[PDB]
Design a protein around this motif. Structure first.
Motif, PDB file in Angstrom:
ATOM      1  N   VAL A  88       0.681  -1.225  -0.066  1.00  0.00           N
ATOM      2  CA  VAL A  88       0.197  -0.078  -0.086  1.00  0.00           C
ATOM      3  C   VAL A  88       1.138   1.375  -0.347  1.00  0.00           C
ATOM      4  N   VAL A  89       0.623   2.586  -0.899  1.00  0.00           N
ATOM      5  CA  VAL A  89       1.143   3.008  -0.837  1.00  0.00           C
ATOM      6  C   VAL A  89       0.775   4.815  -1.059  1.00  0.00           C
ATOM      7  N   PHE A  90       0.477   5.713  -0.166  1.00  0.00           N
ATOM      8  CA  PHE A  90      -0.477   7.145  -0.159  1.00  0.00           C
ATOM      9  C   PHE A  90       0.369   7.830   0.124  1.00  0.00           C
ATOM     10  N   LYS A  91       0.249   8.787   0.345  1.00  0.00           N
ATOM     11  CA  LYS A  91       1.328  10.586   0.712  1.00  0.00           C
ATOM     12  C   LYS A  91       0.525  10.905   2.256  1.00  0.00           C
ATOM     13  N   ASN A  92       1.886  11.463   2.107  1.00  0.00           N
ATOM     14  CA  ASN A  92       1.201  12.440   3.807  1.00  0.00           C
ATOM     15  C   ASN A  92       0.325  12.192   3.695  1.00  0.00           C
ATOM     16  N   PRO A  99      -4.561   7.924  -5.948  1.00  0.00           N
ATOM     17  CA  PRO A  99      -3.297   8.151  -5.993  1.00  0.00           C
ATOM     18  C   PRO A  99      -2.745   9.352  -7.052  1.00  0.00           C
ATOM     19  N   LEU A 100      -3.395  10.730  -6.717  1.00  0.00           N
ATOM     20  CA  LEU A 100      -2.178  11.863  -8.226  1.00  0.00           C
ATOM     21  C   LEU A 100      -1.313  12.099  -8.303  1.00  0.00           C
ATOM     22  N   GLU A 101      -1.641  11.279  -9.503  1.00  0.00           N
ATOM     23  CA  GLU A 101      -0.680  10.973 -10.419  1.00  0.00           C
ATOM     24  C   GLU A 101      -0.751  11.935 -11.727  1.00  0.00           C
ATOM     25  N   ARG A 102      -1.487  12.452 -12.002  1.00  0.00           N
ATOM     26  CA  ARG A 102      -0.868  14.071 -12.485  1.00  0.00           C
ATOM     27  C   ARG A 102       0.769  14.507 -12.624  1.00  0.00           C
ATOM     28  N   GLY A 103       0.888  14.469 -11.286  1.00  0.00           N
ATOM     29  CA  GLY A 103       2.029  14.755 -11.117  1.00  0.00           C
ATOM     30  C   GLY A 103       2.621  13.308 -10.204  1.00  0.00           C
ATOM     31  N   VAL A 104       3.501  12.450 -10.386  1.00  0.00           N
ATOM     32  CA  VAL A 104       3.455  11.049 -10.385  1.00  0.00           C
ATOM     33  C   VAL A 104       3.977  12.116  -8.942  1.00  0.00           C
ATOM     34  N   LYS A 142      -8.503  -2.550   5.955  1.00  0.00           N
ATOM     35  CA  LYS A 142      -8.725  -2.642   7.688  1.00  0.00           C
ATOM     36  C   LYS A 142     -10.079  -1.943   7.091  1.00  0.00           C
ATOM     37  N   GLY A 143     -11.201  -1.426   8.717  1.00  0.00           N
ATOM     38  CA  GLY A 143     -12.002  -0.624   8.758  1.00  0.00           C
ATOM     39  C   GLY A 143     -11.868   0.530   7.686  1.00  0.00           C
ATOM     40  N   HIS A 144     -10.833   0.703   7.078  1.00  0.00           N
ATOM     41  CA  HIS A 144     -10.297   1.802   6.049  1.00  0.00           C
ATOM     42  C   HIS A 144     -10.537   0.929   4.626  1.00  0.00           C
ATOM     43  N   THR A 145     -10.615   1.905   3.804  1.00  0.00           N
ATOM     44  CA  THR A 145     -10.589   1.394   2.056  1.00  0.00           C
ATOM     45  C   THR A 145      -9.897   2.181   1.982  1.00  0.00           C
ATOM     46  N   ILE A 146      -8.997   1.163   0.527  1.00  0.00           N
ATOM     47  CA  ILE A 146      -7.963   2.173  -0.712  1.00  0.00           C
ATOM     48  C   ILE A 146      -8.483   1.877  -1.993  1.00  0.00           C
ATOM     49  N   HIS A 147      -8.378   2.784  -2.575  1.00  0.00           N
ATOM     50  CA  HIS A 147      -8.071   2.926  -4.333  1.00  0.00           C
ATOM     51  C   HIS A 147      -7.574   1.950  -4.774  1.00  0.00           C
ATOM     52  N   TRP A 148      -7.941   1.271  -5.636  1.00  0.00           N
ATOM     53  CA  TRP A 148      -7.337   0.149  -6.813  1.00  0.00           C
ATOM     54  C   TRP A 148      -6.092   0.578  -6.887  1.00  0.00           C
ATOM     55  N   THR A 149      -6.009   1.912  -7.662  1.00  0.00           N
ATOM     56  CA  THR A 149      -4.819   1.904  -8.268  1.00  0.00           C
ATOM     57  C   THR A 149      -3.064   2.435  -6.960  1.00  0.00           C
ATOM     58  N   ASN A 314       6.162  -5.096 -12.057  1.00  0.00           N
ATOM     59  CA  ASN A 314       7.068  -3.717 -12.966  1.00  0.00           C
ATOM     60  C   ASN A 314       5.262  -2.955 -12.525  1.00  0.00           C
ATOM     61  N   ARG A 315       4.411  -3.229 -12.112  1.00  0.00           N
ATOM     62  CA  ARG A 315       3.052  -1.513 -11.835  1.00  0.00           C
ATOM     63  C   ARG A 315       4.546  -1.233 -11.155  1.00  0.00           C
ATOM     64  N   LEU A 316       5.200  -1.782  -9.527  1.00  0.00           N
ATOM     65  CA  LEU A 316       5.705  -1.017  -8.559  1.00  0.00           C
ATOM     66  C   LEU A 316       6.611   0.170  -8.885  1.00  0.00           C
ATOM     67  N   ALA A 317       6.805  -0.895 -10.642  1.00  0.00           N
ATOM     68  CA  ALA A 317       8.522  -0.316 -10.975  1.00  0.00           C
ATOM     69  C   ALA A 317       8.006   1.279 -12.073  1.00  0.00           C
ATOM     70  N   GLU A 318       6.577   1.587 -11.826  1.00  0.00           N
ATOM     71  CA  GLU A 318       6.678   2.496 -12.761  1.00  0.00           C
ATOM     72  C   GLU A 318       6.139   3.588 -11.607  1.00  0.00           C
ATOM     73  N   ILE A 319       5.641   3.030 -10.983  1.00  0.00           N
ATOM     74  CA  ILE A 319       4.677   4.202  -9.088  1.00  0.00           C
ATOM     75  C   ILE A 319       5.673   4.480  -9.168  1.00  0.00           C
ATOM     76  N   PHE A 320       7.236   4.580  -9.148  1.00  0.00           N
ATOM     77  CA  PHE A 320       8.198   4.930  -7.716  1.00  0.00           C
ATOM     78  C   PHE A 320       9.388   6.164  -9.289  1.00  0.00           C
ATOM     79  N   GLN A 321       8.838   5.756 -10.617  1.00  0.00           N
ATOM     80  CA  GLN A 321       9.445   6.350 -11.242  1.00  0.00           C
ATOM     81  C   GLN A 321      11.149   5.300 -12.400  1.00  0.00           C
ATOM     82  N   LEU A 322      11.025   4.302 -11.508  1.00  0.00           N
ATOM     83  CA  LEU A 322      11.918   3.248 -11.983  1.00  0.00           C
ATOM     84  C   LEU A 322      11.674   2.355 -13.072  1.00  0.00           C
ATOM     85  N   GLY A 323      12.977   1.686 -13.209  1.00  0.00           N
ATOM     86  CA  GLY A 323      12.463   1.518 -14.401  1.00  0.00           C
ATOM     87  C   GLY A 323      11.954   0.007 -14.525  1.00  0.00           C
TER      88      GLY A 323
END
Lengths: 361, 361, 361
Positions: A88-92, A99-104, A142-149, A314-323
Motif C-alpha cells: 500500500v502506498v499513499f502520500k502524507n 493517488p494523484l498521478e497527474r504529477g506522479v 482494514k476498517g479503512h478502504t484503499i483505491h485500486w490504483t 513492474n507496476r511498482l516499478a512505474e509508480i516510483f519512476q523506476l525502470g
C-alpha cells in the motif's frame, strides 16, 4: 476396463468423486506460524528475491534495494502464506480515493505491506471495459478502504474465474495447495513422538487381581509392583508365580517411514523445492549459488519469477519512476569462454565483437 | 491363445471392454485448484514459454514480452487445466461481430484471457467450405458472445471428430488424461495419512466386560483404563488378570510404496514430465538450463511447442502485426567449436564462412 | 518333445490356438482419448516430424512448414490412433470427382485432415491394372465422397490382403497392436488404486452379534462401535471381551509390480519407445536431441519414417509442386572432424575436397 460384475462400481473410479477443500482464513493464519511451511514460505520467497533482480537503471543503483526491496519480501512472503500479498502506498495525507498521478508522487510517500488475512479484495467490474472480472476496483485493507490504483497486489496462483470470489479476488495460499499435506505430515509427526513412550509395555498378568480390585483392597499389590518396578533392571530377576504370567507387548508404527516418505515427496512437488531440502540434506545439491545447485529448482522459482512477481513489481516499478525491472541469472566460469571469444580473431589486434554480448563486466 | 475350457471368457480380454470417463467441467475446475496438478500445469506451461520464443522481429524486441507474453502464460495454463485456453481481443467498443481488420487494429485494443470453464465453443460449420467441423464459428465467453476471428483459442490435444462436441470444440484437460491418476494418487495419499494413527491399537480383552456394558454400569472400568492409559509407558508395567488378555494389533498399508510407485510412474508418462520431478528429486537431471537437464523432457515440451502453441501464437502474431514467432533452443559450450570453425582456413586471414551459421552472437 | 502320456494334449502347445482381436472403431476412438496412448500417439508422431524433414527445395524454404506441416502431424497422429490418417485437398468448388491436375492446382486450394473414424476406404479394383487390391479407388469421408487422387492416405502397418477389408483398406491402430496391453495395464491400474483402501480391515469378531442382527435390535452395538472407531488410535486402548476377538486382515496385490512390469515391457516393445519413457525416467537417455539420446529409439522412428510417412508425404510433395521430401538426421560434434578434413592436405593451400560432403554449413 469395465464389465461383467460389480467391479464397475466399487473401484476407485466411481467410488469417490473429486472435491477440493477451501481452508478458512483463520486456518490459513495458523499454518503461516507453523514451523514446516514457515521455512517453505521463507525459502521460496528468498529464492525469488535474493539478488536476482535485474535493474536496467544503473543510475541510483537499486534505490529499490535500500527502501522497499525488504518490504516486498515480507509482502511476497504474504503471497505464499495467504494467497494475497499487498503493498500500500499513499502520500502524507490519508485518502480513500486514487493517488494523484497527474504529477506522479516524487518519493513524498510512505510504504505499507499487508497479509491477505487483514487485506482482501472487494469490488470487481463485471463488464469488460476497464479491468476484467479478475481485477478488483476498490477494497478494504482494514476498517479503512484503499483505491485500486493506490494498492499493489501480490497475487499467487489463481483459480478459475467461476470461483475467484471464494478466494476474494486473488491468489491461493500454498496451504490450500498442500492442506492435504501439512495435515498429513503433522499427523505423521504427532503420532511419531507418542509411539516411543508406548513402544513396549510390561504386563503383569496376575491371578487374583480380578478379586483385589473387585474387593477394592488392591492397594498392596500396586505398592509391591511399584516397588518392584522401582528396580526392575538387568540386575534383579522378577519373582512371580506359576499361575502368574509376565509378558511384553510391543506396538509401533510399522510403516512410519513409508507414509512420511509419501507425504514429503508431494510437498517437494507442489512447493517446487527439492526432496533434499525437506529431508534436510541441503548440503548435497540445493544451495544458494546458481552455478549448478540453485539450478536444482531454479525453474520453479523462474516460473514464480515470471508469473506472480513480474506483474506487481513492474507496476511498482512505474509508480516510483523506476525502470522496468526483470530477473536474469560465477563469471569465472564464463571467463574461460570470454578468452576464447578474444582469441577468435586476432586480426592483428581487433576487438572481439562477442565480448560485449556476454559477461564482460 | 484361446481354447479348451472357459479360460476364453474370464481372462482380461473379454471380461472387460474399454471405456473412457468424461470428467465434468466442475470436476475439471477442482483439479485446477488441487496441489498436485497445480504444479503439473505450472511446470509444463512455464517450460513451454520461459524464454523459449524465437522472435524474428528484433526491432521492437519482444513487445510481445512486456504486454501479453504473460497473458498467454495464464491462457496456456488454461489450456492444460481445462482443455481450452482463450485470448480475447477487441477495440474500445464492445462488439459481438468481427474485428475491423480492414485496417488492422494498431494497438488500439485490449486483451483478455479466459479459462475453458467460462469460455466454450458453440457453432461449427458442418460444410467443408470455410472451417472444417473442428473450428467453431461463433461462441459465447459469458452472457456475452464473441466473433470467431475476434478470439484466439488455446486448444489442447483433441479427440476424434465424432465426439468433439462432448469437449465443446477444443482440447482436453490434462485431468481427462490423468483422471484415472489423480483420483488414484489422492486415494493413495488420503489413506496414507490415516493409516499411522491406526498403525497399532492396544487391546484390553477383559473378562466380564461382556456384563458391565450389558448392565450399563461400565463407568468404572472405562475410568480405570483411562487412568491406566494415562501413564502406560516403558516405565510402568500393566496389571491385569490371568483371565484377562492384553494384545496388540497392527494394520498398515502393506504395499503403499508399490501403488504409489505405479500411480506416479503413469503421471510422469502422460504429463511428459520425468519421474524425478514427481518424486521431488528435481536436483538430479530435470532443471531449467537446456544444456543437458531440460533435455530430460524437452521433447515433450517441443511436442507441445509445435502442436498446440504454434497455431494460436502465429494467429496472435499476425493480429498484432508481429512477425511469425517460433521456438529454437550455454553458448560457451558452442564457442569452442566456434574457434574450431575459425581455425579451419586461415588462408592468410579470411572469414570463417561457418561462423555466421552458428551462435556468432 | 511329445510322448508317453497325456502331456501331449494339456501343454500350452495344443491347449490353445492363436487368434487376434479386431477392436471395433468405437473402442478405437476411446483409446485415442485415454491418457496412456495419448502420449504414445503424441510422442511417436512428434518424434517423426519434429524438424526431421529434409527439404531439397531451399527456395521458398519449408513452405510446407507454415501451411500444412501442422496438418500432417494431426493427420499422422490419426495414423497411429486409428490406423488411417487422411489429408483431403480440393479447390474452392466441392467436387466428388478427381482434382483437375491438367493444370496442377497452384495453391488455389484448401486442406483438410481426417481420422480413420469418420474417414474410411471403400472401393478396391480387384484387377491388377491400375492399383492393386490394396489401394482404394473412391471412398466416403462423411455423407460426402472424395475421389482417390483427391485424397492422401496416412496408412499404418497393414495386414495380409486376405483380411484388408476388415480394417477397411489401410493401416492398423496401435491399439490393435496393444489392445492386449492397454486393457491389461488399465486392469493393473484400476485394481492398484482400490487395493489400498482395503489394504487392512479391522474386524470385531463379537459374540452375540449373531443374535443382535437376528433380533434386528442391533442398533446399539453399531453405535458403540461407531463411537469406538471414532477415536480408535495409538492413544486409547480398545475394551473388548474374553469371548470377543479383535483381529486384523490384510489383502494386497502381492505381485502388482511384476505384472505392471510385464505389461509395460511389452508396450515399450510394440510401440518402439523405450522402457524408460513408460516408467517416466525420460531424463536418462530418451530425449529430443539426436546426438545419442534420440538414438535410443530413432531406428523405430526411422522405420516409421521410411515405411508409412514417405508414401503420402511424397504424394503430398508432388501435389503442391514441392520437391521430393525425405528425412536425414550437434554439428559441433562433427566440426572437430571437419578441421581434420582441412588439415589433411595443406598442399600449400588447397580446398579440402571432403569439406563439401559433410556438414560444411
Amino acid at each position: 476396463d469395465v464389465l461383467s460384475g460389480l467391479i464397475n462400481r466399487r473401484n476407485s473410479m466411481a467410488r469417490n468423486r473429486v472435491s477440493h477443500r477451501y481452508l478458512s482464513d483463520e486456518e490459513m493464519r495458523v499454518m503461516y506460524k507453523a514451523g514446516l511451511m514457515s521455512k517453505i514460505i521463507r525459502l521460496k520467497a528468498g529464492y525469488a528475491l535474493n539478488d536476482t533482480l535485474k535493474f536496467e537503471s544503473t543510475q541510483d543503483q537499486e534505490i529499490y534495494k535500500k527502501r522497499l526491496s525488504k518490504h516486498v519480501k515480507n509482502a511476497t512472503k504474504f503471497m505464499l502464506g495467504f494467497g494475497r500479498g499487498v503493498i500500500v502506498v499513499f502520500k502524507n495525507g490519508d485518502d480513500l480515493s486514487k493517488p494523484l498521478e497527474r504529477g506522479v508522487d516524487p518519493k513524498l510517500l510512505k510504504i505499507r505491506v499487508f497479509s491477505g488475512d487483514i487485506a482482501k479484495g472487494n469490488n470487481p467490474d463485471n463488464d469488460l471495459r476497464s479491468e476484467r472480472y479478475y481485477k478488483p476496483k476498490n477494497y478494504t485493507i482494514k476498517g479503512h478502504t484503499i483505491h485500486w490504483t493506490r494498492v499493489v497486489d501480490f497475487t499467487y496462483y489463481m483459480p478459475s474465474e467461476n470461483e475467484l470470489p471464494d478466494y476474494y479476488y486473488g491468489g491461493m495460499s500454498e496451504s490450500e495447495l498442500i492442506y492435504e499435506q501439512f495435515i498429513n505430515d503433522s499427523v505423521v509427526q504427532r503420532a511419531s513422538g507418542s509411539i516411543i513412550e508406548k513402544a513396549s509395555t510390561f504386563v503383569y498378568k496376575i491371578k487374583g487381581y480380578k478379586q483385589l480390585i473387585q474387593a477394592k483392597k488392591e492397594e498392596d499389590i500396586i505398592k509391591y509392583v511399584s516397588t518392584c518396578e522401582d528396580g526392575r533392571s538387568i540386575y534383579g530377576g522378577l519373582i512371580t508365580d506359576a499361575d502368574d504370567e509376565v509378558s511384553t507387548l510391543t506396538q509401533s508404527l510399522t510403516d512410519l517411514d513409508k507414509v512420511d516418505n509419501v507425504t514429503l515427496r508431494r510437498i517437494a512437488m507442489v512447493t517446487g523445492l527439492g526432496m533434499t531440502v525437506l529431508i534436510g540434506e541441503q548440503a548435497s545439491g540445493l544451495n544458494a549459488s546458481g552455478e549448478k545447485e540453485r539450478q536444482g529448482f531454479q525453474d520453479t522459482i523462474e516460473n514464480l519469477q515470471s508469473d506472480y512477481l513480474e506483474d506487481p513489481l513492474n507496476r511498482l516499478a512505474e509508480i516510483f519512476q523506476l525502470g522496468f525491472i526483470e530477473f536474469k541469472d560465477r563469471v569465472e566460469y564464463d571467463k574461460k569462454a570470454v578468452d576464447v571469444a578474444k582469441v577468435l580473431w586476432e586480426l592483428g589486434e581487433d576487438y572481439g565483437a562477442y565480448l560485449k554480448d556476454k559477461d564482460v563486466v
